[PDB]
Amino acid sequence: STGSATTTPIDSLDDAYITPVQIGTPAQTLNLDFDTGSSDLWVFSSETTASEVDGQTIYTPSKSTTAKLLSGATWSISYGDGSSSSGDVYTDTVSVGGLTVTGQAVESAKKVSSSFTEDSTIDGLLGLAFSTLNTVSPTQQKTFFDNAKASLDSPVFTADLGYHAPGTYNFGFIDTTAYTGSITYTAVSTKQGFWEWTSTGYAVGSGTFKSTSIDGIADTGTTLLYLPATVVSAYWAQVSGAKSSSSVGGYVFPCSATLPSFTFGVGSARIVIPGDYIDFGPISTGSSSCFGGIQSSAGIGINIFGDVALKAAFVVFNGATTPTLGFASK
């Protein structure tokens, strides 16, 4: 089997991407944030505290003839941005782009933190990291991909995120028309539950490539590119007037600037992030200070190849017995 679904930016900045997901019988379609940095499929629901729902579409398990309470199971998750959610668990039928899993754990939120409430466009998350990170207790549950894997034509999924445009998540096949050149595959460590790999270096604009190992995670659920402070300083030094602002929470730059590209290495291959992808717009409405899309990972404890980096590539998440990642230009 295979599946193929379009993923759409939630706003004009590509702050996140939503993908429609069918849950239950009859189908209830929710727009979920596919997150290769976490491993829980959780949704706003008829159980979510009413004051914490503000425009999201909810899953109502009592209206699904295939929903079953997973007795005694609870979940609770905290994300790197400080947001969180928790609740109980049903199993139900879940379909993505024509690919169906029966008995998928659907984590129903009883509580969500303010940032989730305040984002009416995201109805929940669909985790695509390794199932060892799933938070369901006392019986840990599998991700949608883990449950689908054995049925897929090939044990892979691909992320093809758009810049200010829709893109595609495919399951079970590699669309050879969706990228240019060849796909370069690179080793993955699953020791922390992430799609963790080592980039071979970077370049800023037209500058020379610096060969240096940068361990980090391929994380579709993180907006920006978080790299070591040395690398980030080297980037922003090429932008007149750019500075790190403690009050804003990162590097800002004059909105009048033209940003240089940023290249990262995948083995001997190179992925180029155009400068425009690194512009996240005014820090507040009407400001001429703009927020940068490359930020320091110092204090986060891990480097994160988030959407800014991944949207410059066609990315293969290879869930073979020994997982690997593939990157191609597009």
Helix (H, G, I), strand (E, B) or coil at 297: coil
| Of 14, 35, 88, 307, catalytic | 35
What's the burial of 8, exposed, middle or buried (CB within 10 Å: 0-12/13-18/19+)?
middle
- The residues pairing with 17 across neighbouring beta strands, listed in sequence order, are 9
State both tokens at 136.
Answer: 């369901």
Q: Containing H/E element for 33?
A: strand 28-35
**How far is Cα 96 from Cα 20, in angstroms, rounded to an integer?**
7
**How far is Cα 61 from Cα 54, in angstroms, rounded to an integer?**
19
Tally of helices (H runs) and strands (E runs) in the chain: 4, 24
CATH code that applies to domain 175-330: 2.40.70.10
**How far is Cα 260 from Cα 87, in angstroms, rounded to an integer?**
44
Domain 5-174 matches domain 175-330 at the CATH topology level: yes
Supply the DSSP string of 37-48, one letter for each residue. Answer: T---EEE-BTTS
Calculate the CA dihedral of residues 97, 103, 131, 138 and round it to 10 degrees: 150
Where do the domains of the chain lie? 5-174, 175-330
Given in angstroms, what resolution was this structure solved at?
1.0
Note if 14 is an active site residue.
Answer: no
- Identify which of 118, 110, 72, 112 has the alpha carbon closest to the alpha carbon of residue 91: 72
CATH code that applies to domain 5-174: 2.40.70.10
Give me the count of residues in the chain.
330
Task: Please name the residue that has the structure tokens 């995120």.
Answer: 161
| Of 38, 39, 95, 199, catalytic | 199
Note if 88 is an active site residue.
Answer: no
